[PDB]
Design a protein around this nucleic acid. Structure first.
Ligand SMILES: [Mg+2]
Ligand SMILES: [Mg+2]
Ligand SMILES: [Mg+2]
Ligand SMILES: [Mg+2]
Ligand SMILES: [Mg+2]
Ligand SMILES: [Mg+2]
Ligand SMILES: [Mg+2]
Ligand SMILES: [Mg+2]
Ligand SMILES: [Mg+2]
Ligand SMILES: [Mg+2]
Ligand SMILES: [Mg+2]
Ligand SMILES: [Mg+2]
Ligand SMILES: [Mg+2]
Ligand SMILES: [Mg+2]
Ligand SMILES: [Mg+2]
Ligand SMILES: [Mg+2]
Ligand SMILES: [Mg+2]
Ligand SMILES: [Mg+2]
Ligand SMILES: [Mg+2]
Ligand SMILES: [Mg+2]
Ligand SMILES: [Mg+2]
Ligand SMILES: [Mg+2]
Ligand SMILES: [Mg+2]
Ligand SMILES: [Mg+2]
Ligand SMILES: [Mg+2]
Ligand SMILES: [Mg+2]
Ligand SMILES: [Mg+2]
Ligand SMILES: [Mg+2]
Ligand SMILES: [Mg+2]
Ligand SMILES: [Mg+2]
Ligand SMILES: [Mg+2]
Ligand SMILES: [Mg+2]
Ligand SMILES: [Mg+2]
Ligand SMILES: [Mg+2]
Ligand SMILES: [Mg+2]
Ligand SMILES: [Mg+2]
Ligand SMILES: [Mg+2]
Ligand SMILES: [Mg+2]
Ligand SMILES: [Mg+2]
Ligand SMILES: [Mg+2]
Ligand SMILES: [Mg+2]
Ligand SMILES: [Mg+2]
Ligand SMILES: [Mg+2]
Ligand SMILES: [Mg+2]
Ligand SMILES: [Mg+2]
Ligand SMILES: [Mg+2]
Ligand SMILES: [Mg+2]
Ligand SMILES: [Mg+2]
Ligand SMILES: [Mg+2]
Ligand SMILES: [Mg+2]
Ligand SMILES: [Mg+2]
Ligand SMILES: [Mg+2]
Ligand SMILES: [Mg+2]
Ligand SMILES: [Mg+2]
Ligand SMILES: [Mg+2]
Ligand SMILES: [Mg+2]
Ligand SMILES: [Mg+2]
Ligand SMILES: [Mg+2]
Ligand SMILES: [Mg+2]
Ligand SMILES: [Mg+2]
Ligand SMILES: [Mg+2]
Ligand SMILES: [Mg+2]
Ligand SMILES: [Mg+2]
Ligand SMILES: [Mg+2]
Ligand SMILES: [Mg+2]
Ligand SMILES: [Mg+2]
Ligand SMILES: [Mg+2]
Ligand SMILES: [Mg+2]
Ligand SMILES: [Mg+2]
Ligand SMILES: [Mg+2]
Ligand SMILES: [Mg+2]
Ligand SMILES: [Mg+2]
Ligand SMILES: [Mg+2]
Ligand SMILES: [Mg+2]
Ligand SMILES: [Mg+2]
Ligand SMILES: [Mg+2]
Ligand SMILES: [Mg+2]
Ligand SMILES: [Mg+2]
Ligand SMILES: [Mg+2]
Ligand SMILES: [Mg+2]
Ligand SMILES: [Mg+2]
Ligand SMILES: [Mg+2]
Ligand SMILES: [Mg+2]
Ligand SMILES: [Mg+2]
Ligand SMILES: [Mg+2]
Ligand SMILES: [Mg+2]
Ligand SMILES: [Mg+2]
Ligand SMILES: [Mg+2]
Ligand SMILES: [Mg+2]
Ligand SMILES: [Mg+2]
Ligand SMILES: [Mg+2]
Ligand SMILES: [Mg+2]
Ligand SMILES: [Mg+2]
Ligand SMILES: [Mg+2]
Ligand SMILES: [Mg+2]
Ligand SMILES: [Mg+2]
Ligand SMILES: [Mg+2]
Ligand SMILES: [Mg+2]
Ligand SMILES: [Mg+2]
Ligand SMILES: [Mg+2]
Ligand SMILES: [Mg+2]
Ligand SMILES: [Mg+2]
Ligand SMILES: [Mg+2]
Ligand SMILES: [Mg+2]
Ligand SMILES: [Mg+2]
Ligand SMILES: [Mg+2]
Ligand SMILES: [Mg+2]
Ligand SMILES: [Mg+2]
Ligand SMILES: [Mg+2]
Ligand SMILES: [Mg+2]
Ligand SMILES: [Mg+2]
Ligand SMILES: [Mg+2]
Ligand SMILES: [Mg+2]
Ligand SMILES: [Mg+2]
Ligand SMILES: [Mg+2]
Ligand SMILES: [Mg+2]
Ligand SMILES: [Mg+2]
Ligand SMILES: [Mg+2]
Ligand SMILES: [Mg+2]
Ligand SMILES: [Mg+2]
Ligand SMILES: [Mg+2]
Ligand SMILES: [Mg+2]
Ligand SMILES: [Mg+2]
Ligand SMILES: [Mg+2]
Ligand SMILES: [Mg+2]
Ligand SMILES: [Mg+2]
Ligand SMILES: [Mg+2]
Ligand SMILES: [Mg+2]
Ligand SMILES: [Mg+2]
Ligand SMILES: [Mg+2]
Ligand SMILES: [Mg+2]
Ligand SMILES: [Mg+2]
Ligand SMILES: [Mg+2]
Ligand SMILES: [Mg+2]
Ligand SMILES: [Mg+2]
Ligand SMILES: [Mg+2]
Ligand SMILES: [Mg+2]
Ligand SMILES: [Mg+2]
Ligand SMILES: [Mg+2]
Ligand SMILES: [Mg+2]
Ligand SMILES: [Mg+2]
Ligand SMILES: [Mg+2]
Ligand SMILES: [Mg+2]
Ligand SMILES: [Mg+2]
Ligand SMILES: [Mg+2]
Ligand SMILES: [Mg+2]
Ligand SMILES: [Mg+2]
Ligand SMILES: [Mg+2]
Ligand SMILES: [Mg+2]
Ligand SMILES: [Mg+2]
Ligand SMILES: [Mg+2]
Ligand SMILES: [Mg+2]
Ligand SMILES: [Mg+2]
Ligand SMILES: [Mg+2]
Ligand SMILES: [Mg+2]
Ligand SMILES: [Mg+2]
Ligand SMILES: [Mg+2]
Ligand SMILES: [Mg+2]
Ligand SMILES: [Mg+2]
Ligand SMILES: [Mg+2]
Ligand SMILES: [Mg+2]
Ligand SMILES: [Mg+2]
Ligand SMILES: [Mg+2]
Ligand SMILES: [Mg+2]
Ligand SMILES: [Mg+2]
Ligand SMILES: [Mg+2]
Ligand SMILES: [Mg+2]
Ligand SMILES: [Mg+2]
Ligand SMILES: [Mg+2]
Ligand SMILES: [Mg+2]
Ligand SMILES: [Mg+2]
Ligand SMILES: [Mg+2]
Ligand SMILES: [Mg+2]
Ligand SMILES: [Mg+2]
Ligand SMILES: [Mg+2]
Ligand SMILES: [Mg+2]
Ligand SMILES: [Mg+2]
Ligand SMILES: [Mg+2]
Ligand SMILES: [Mg+2]
Ligand SMILES: [Mg+2]
Ligand SMILES: [Mg+2]
Ligand SMILES: [Mg+2]
Ligand SMILES: [Mg+2]
Ligand SMILES: [Mg+2]
Ligand SMILES: [Mg+2]
Ligand SMILES: [Mg+2]
Lengths: 138, 124
RNA sequence: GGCUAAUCCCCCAUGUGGACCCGCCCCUUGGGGUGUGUCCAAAGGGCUUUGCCCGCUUCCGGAUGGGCCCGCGUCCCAUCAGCUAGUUGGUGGGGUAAUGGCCCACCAAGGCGACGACGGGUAGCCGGUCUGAGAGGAUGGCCGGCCACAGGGGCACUGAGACACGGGCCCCACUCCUACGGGAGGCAGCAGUUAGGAAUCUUCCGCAAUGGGCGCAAGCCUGACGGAGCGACGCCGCUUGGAGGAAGAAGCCCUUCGGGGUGUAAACUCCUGAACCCGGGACGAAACCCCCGACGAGGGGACUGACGGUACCGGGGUAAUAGCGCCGGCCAACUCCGUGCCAGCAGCCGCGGUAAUACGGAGGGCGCGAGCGUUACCCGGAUUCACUGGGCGUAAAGGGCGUGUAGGCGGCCUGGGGCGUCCCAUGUGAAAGACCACGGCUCAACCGUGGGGGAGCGUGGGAUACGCUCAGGCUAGACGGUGGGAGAGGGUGGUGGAAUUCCCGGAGUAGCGGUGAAAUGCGCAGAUACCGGGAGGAACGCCGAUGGCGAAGGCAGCCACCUGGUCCACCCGUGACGCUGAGGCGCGAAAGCGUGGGGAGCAAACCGGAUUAGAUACCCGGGUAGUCCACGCCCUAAACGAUGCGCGCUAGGUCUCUGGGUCUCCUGGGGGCCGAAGCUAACGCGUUAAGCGCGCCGCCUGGGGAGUACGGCCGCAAGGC
RNA sequence: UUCCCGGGCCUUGUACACACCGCCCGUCACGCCAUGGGAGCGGGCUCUACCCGAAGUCGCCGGGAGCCUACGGGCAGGCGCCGAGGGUAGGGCCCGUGACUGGGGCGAAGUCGUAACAAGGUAGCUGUACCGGAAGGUGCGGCUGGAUCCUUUCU
């Protein structure tokens, strides 16, 4: 049993991008799908699609990278430089609308789950709602 | 430690022990001398240091360093303890204050007279 | 003992009304209405006395003030683990303004505790304050709010209100009066004395202002208060002069004897004018009162200072206090002389035993400046208790291993709820402080006016992604079914061969043994060596591996039985049944203990022989406990991978054990070696992570003191935790 | 080319680095404060059983046993529960003193050894156990955090 399936998605993605994979499969749930929708819209991934693997439904996240590089270490820059969990089971975190973090002076995002649904930080301030603070990504 | 463990147990604030029981919280303490001795310094140096055993107003009895050059302190003279130690002498935690009570300020001393308790020389 | 007044006490009356029992209605805890019945009021005083004023009485309401109750929050020690007799509830009662074990009788046997009861230690709490980037840490002086106390302990009376600081009764300690019988006291009120202490003020002025008590008022009281006094204790403002003045006087300082410094600094020139003298001189202060009007409104309209002749304005007027720390690094400021492990400095590192930029003066320099240093304490730094924001292979740190209780944590889909969570509205968040703005003292400190901010909690409304919950599905986790497998996994019984020792027998002599050499020792009672037979105990050669199994400790001859774990195939069954696990419970090498066995070899202690300067050791000869078995304790370890368990993710290559397969190879599960990415202080780790993540448990916080002391618990002891 | 002296190169171990004429361990004697143990003693608090019990509220009596009366009752007075504190007997906490001793930690440096660091000269460490002037030796089991295929001290 994955103890925190959301963290597991984020990590799967982290390890994937770090070895420069073209894609990764993460076991699927509507909530994960929401998160992904936000990443995709936000430019971090090429987007994702649903697949079946041995009959069991997954999500291919397609990974995005910078171009090749000069000198030693031609490996391209990362599009997701950083991805991390905030609220985890066992310490849960909730921001009011006035506690929503400005992530890397705004070149990053924070993904919140709210009662209006899963939004970015800007998205939530504009909507004007607080919620469970899920990922921090930049 | 896990957060659950921090709820269950939590961090421990760190108590510190007072390097000066002048007791009382007091900044200084008055006492009477007992022994006025000379003392041998700890291994890295050599000298003859002037220290005095003191019975305080706190019911405490301790050796105290006599700073400056000359000192008029004797067996029954009464004195004021300062605090601060001498790194190279075993077991002496406090200082004598010159110029207070029977402790006489350092004679002839012209340089830093705030410490050592000497007053200002007149020049014409 | 006697006289006497009243707004002092008592008895009838009137009952607006109210209290009380009983009934009824509404309301819903004892709120409100109502009917009968019983019960309850008052005081008079002053004027201009045919009217008003000050009062009195019963009631309803308001206002302000308080009582009691509940949720939540509020320090340290678990070396404080059990606490509890009015103690927990009940019925009835007493008490109060009022609920209540608040108190009493009787009844039941409860109530609380690891979510830390009970115990011990410290402590008034808050608004706030200091510090901090913040989170946090620390604190609660002054000012405001609340509490508690008034020499110590108990108690009630009076009253709207007290269990009453300048009220009362009693007990104790202390001081004083005493005709020795008995009495009087109570500054933690303002000043002041005394003691203690490093240390903390005047036995001042005034009720002019504000406020409080009584009074119709005039007025009286007011050490509340408004001022003044003392202390650089803190904050703010100000002075010790301004301009000119040598390519630079003297003195002192260094010197390469050329000169460099103190330095425009001084002298001196000129100018302003702190103090000080002289004169004017406050606001703070208009009410209460008086007059008109109706003692209202309104209109007018006079008295009233402590501070104080102080602030301030005007005039005049003199160049007129500087100190303290520091100058090796941190750290801004360097040179001579003096002193030579001295005298001394010192926050740490460390200076000084003849060139000392570190000691001591001097010149010069830096820093602040009516101050400057020191000591003590708090936060800071210190991300060094890490929520933000740390760690545990070798640095301190993974519990010896497991089982599992509380607890923490929880796959995918749908729905109800809306507890967490989020949003809106509203109440609350006093003032002061803090922030912003404007303003008042010439400025500021200080003060006023206004604005904004705000966590938290109350109420109403709303959202449903996540967390929760309830219900209903699912099968990817987990378990199960069928079949097949490897194994020193455990327990019980049996049996085999080798070797040692010993005993019997044969044969056979003069030694054997042992060491670097030797000796002790054994041998003519015939040893060693050799052959045959017997007894007995312990351990299992080759196979054997860089192997296998087990949670660990650990487990090797062979056979049988009893028994645990595990892996693969099939994709069959259940349907999230999961992970971790404080406490508990069990297991746990060796040595050790108890009772009883057993005893070959080995062997602590011990006995001897050597060696050596000595030998108490290593080396040699003997040898007891022990080693073995049964049962019961002990519970340690380099119990080591010095690496907690579980799950997902992240190149490969090579060797191997063991299953399945279309068996050049592929695919599970183990064991190793190299090595992507990455980690790491490095060494190293690297799909058997020390990588990337999540959950949960254990543990760490400089070394020595010390795994000591004391306390507890366990143990027969040793000794363990 | 084994050995003696001096030396060069690669490698290995180290706790040395004034660098093996190095380090460091312990004993005993000796120069220091602190600690426990500390018999008892001096006293403070609190707990429990019993006994004594001021004040004061509260309950009862209040009688040809007092005082007032309108005869309803009132007061004085008496008794009782409660009760501050006191005493007796032991249980704990705490402070002062303290016969008596444990080691400690450096401390003028002496003493006898050589245990550890190099295969430290018998590899070390280790739980335990007996032993010994002292570092220690030895037994059993373990660990690698061990080198490279007679004895012989110290500076
Ligand atoms: Mg949904
Ligand atoms: Mg898409
Ligand atoms: Mg966070
Ligand atoms: Mg009379
Ligand atoms: Mg009379
Ligand atoms: Mg009369
Ligand atoms: Mg009356
Ligand atoms: Mg009447
Ligand atoms: Mg009526
Ligand atoms: Mg009624
Ligand atoms: Mg009636
Ligand atoms: Mg009358
Ligand atoms: Mg009323
Ligand atoms: Mg109230
Ligand atoms: Mg406190
Ligand atoms: Mg203790
Ligand atoms: Mg009782
Ligand atoms: Mg009772
Ligand atoms: Mg009953
Ligand atoms: Mg009752
Ligand atoms: Mg009352
Ligand atoms: Mg609780
Ligand atoms: Mg406090
Ligand atoms: Mg107190
Ligand atoms: Mg602040
Ligand atoms: Mg601040
Ligand atoms: Mg703060
Ligand atoms: Mg606080
Ligand atoms: Mg506090
Ligand atoms: Mg206070
Ligand atoms: Mg106050
Ligand atoms: Mg209050
Ligand atoms: Mg009291
Ligand atoms: Mg007093
Ligand atoms: Mg007293
Ligand atoms: Mg009292
Ligand atoms: Mg009254
Ligand atoms: Mg009183
Ligand atoms: Mg009181
Ligand atoms: Mg008084
Ligand atoms: Mg009296
Ligand atoms: Mg005095
Ligand atoms: Mg004094
Ligand atoms: Mg004053
Ligand atoms: Mg006066
Ligand atoms: Mg007045
Ligand atoms: Mg007045
Ligand atoms: Mg009045
Ligand atoms: Mg009048
Ligand atoms: Mg008076
Ligand atoms: Mg005053
Ligand atoms: Mg002074
Ligand atoms: Mg001063
Ligand atoms: Mg000038
Ligand atoms: Mg000159
Ligand atoms: Mg000159
Ligand atoms: Mg002039
Ligand atoms: Mg005025
Ligand atoms: Mg005026
Ligand atoms: Mg007027
Ligand atoms: Mg008139
Ligand atoms: Mg008027
Ligand atoms: Mg008027
Ligand atoms: Mg007046
Ligand atoms: Mg005046
Ligand atoms: Mg003037
Ligand atoms: Mg003038
Ligand atoms: Mg002048
Ligand atoms: Mg400097
Ligand atoms: Mg100095
Ligand atoms: Mg000289
Ligand atoms: Mg010199
Ligand atoms: Mg020198
Ligand atoms: Mg100097
Ligand atoms: Mg210096
Ligand atoms: Mg100097
Ligand atoms: Mg100078
Ligand atoms: Mg100033
Ligand atoms: Mg100061
Ligand atoms: Mg600090
Ligand atoms: Mg901190
Ligand atoms: Mg910080
Ligand atoms: Mg520290
Ligand atoms: Mg942390
Ligand atoms: Mg936080
Ligand atoms: Mg650390
Ligand atoms: Mg080590
Ligand atoms: Mg370690
Ligand atoms: Mg372990
Ligand atoms: Mg360990
Ligand atoms: Mg459970
Ligand atoms: Mg979930
Ligand atoms: Mg809700
Ligand atoms: Mg709804
Ligand atoms: Mg609000
Ligand atoms: Mg405010
Ligand atoms: Mg103010
Ligand atoms: Mg202000
Ligand atoms: Mg301003
Ligand atoms: Mg202004
Ligand atoms: Mg203000
Ligand atoms: Mg304001
Ligand atoms: Mg406001
Ligand atoms: Mg609400
Ligand atoms: Mg609501
Ligand atoms: Mg809904
Ligand atoms: Mg739902
Ligand atoms: Mg859910
Ligand atoms: Mg749950
Ligand atoms: Mg279900
Ligand atoms: Mg099925
Ligand atoms: Mg299965
Ligand atoms: Mg089948
Ligand atoms: Mg089977
Ligand atoms: Mg077996
Ligand atoms: Mg045999
Ligand atoms: Mg024979
Ligand atoms: Mg013989
Ligand atoms: Mg013969
Ligand atoms: Mg013989
Ligand atoms: Mg024969
Ligand atoms: Mg034979
Ligand atoms: Mg036998
Ligand atoms: Mg046999
Ligand atoms: Mg073998
Ligand atoms: Mg093996
Ligand atoms: Mg089996
Ligand atoms: Mg098969
Ligand atoms: Mg199936
Ligand atoms: Mg089914
Ligand atoms: Mg488990
Ligand atoms: Mg356990
Ligand atoms: Mg055992
Ligand atoms: Mg054993
Ligand atoms: Mg035995
Ligand atoms: Mg035996
Ligand atoms: Mg033997
Ligand atoms: Mg032997
Ligand atoms: Mg011997
Ligand atoms: Mg025995
Ligand atoms: Mg024995
Ligand atoms: Mg046994
Ligand atoms: Mg860990
Ligand atoms: Mg498991
Ligand atoms: Mg491999
Ligand atoms: Mg095969
Ligand atoms: Mg493998
Ligand atoms: Mg295994
Ligand atoms: Mg490697
Ligand atoms: Mg690499
Ligand atoms: Mg890391
Ligand atoms: Mg893993
Ligand atoms: Mg690591
Ligand atoms: Mg320490
Ligand atoms: Mg320690
Ligand atoms: Mg031990
Ligand atoms: Mg003990
Ligand atoms: Mg015992
Ligand atoms: Mg013992
Ligand atoms: Mg032991
Ligand atoms: Mg014992
Ligand atoms: Mg050679
Ligand atoms: Mg060469
Ligand atoms: Mg070389
Ligand atoms: Mg080694
Ligand atoms: Mg080296
Ligand atoms: Mg050396
Ligand atoms: Mg020695
Ligand atoms: Mg002796
Ligand atoms: Mg009585
Ligand atoms: Mg009674
Ligand atoms: Mg009567
Ligand atoms: Mg009576
Ligand atoms: Mg009694
Ligand atoms: Mg008593
Ligand atoms: Mg002693
Ligand atoms: Mg050695
Ligand atoms: Mg040895
Ligand atoms: Mg050795
Ligand atoms: Mg040997
Ligand atoms: Mg031995
Ligand atoms: Mg041993
Ligand atoms: Mg061994
Ligand atoms: Mg080793
Ligand atoms: Mg020798
Ligand atoms: Mg020696």
């Amino acid at each position: 049993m994955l103890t925190d399936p959301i963290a597991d998605m984020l990590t799967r993605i982290r390890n994937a991008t770090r070895v420069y994979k073209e894609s990764t499969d993460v076991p699927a749930s509507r909530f994960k799908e929401e998160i992904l929708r936000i990443l995709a819209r936000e430019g971090f991934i090429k987007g994702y699609e649903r697949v079946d693997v041995d009959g069991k439904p997954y999500l291919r996240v397609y990974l995005k990278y910078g171009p090749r590089r000069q000198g030693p270490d031609p490996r391209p820059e990362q599009v997701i430089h950083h991805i991390r969990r905030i609220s985890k089971p066992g310490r849960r975190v909730y921001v009011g609308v006035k506690e929503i973090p400005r992530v890397r002076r705004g070149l990053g995002i924070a993904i919140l789950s709210t009662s209006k649904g899963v939004l970015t930080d800007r998205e939530a301030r504009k909507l004007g709602v607080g919620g469970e603070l899920i990922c921090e990504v930049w | 430690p896990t957060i659950n463990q921090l709820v269950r147990k939590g961090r421990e604030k760190v108590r510190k022990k007072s390097k000066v029981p002048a007791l009382k919280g007091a900044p200084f303490r008055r006492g009477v001398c007992t022994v006025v001795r000379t003392v041998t310094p700890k291994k890295p140096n050599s000298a003859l240091r002037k220290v005095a055993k003191v019975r305080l107003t706190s019911g405490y009895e301790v050796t105290a360093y006599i700073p400056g050059e000359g000192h008029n302190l004797q067996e029954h003279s009464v004195v004021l303890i300062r605090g601060g130690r001498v790194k190279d002498l075993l077991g002496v935690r406090y200082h004598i204050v010159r110029g207070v009570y029977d402790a006489a300020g350092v004679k002839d001393r012209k340089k830093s007279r705030s410490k050592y308790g000497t007053k200002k020389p007149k020049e014409a």
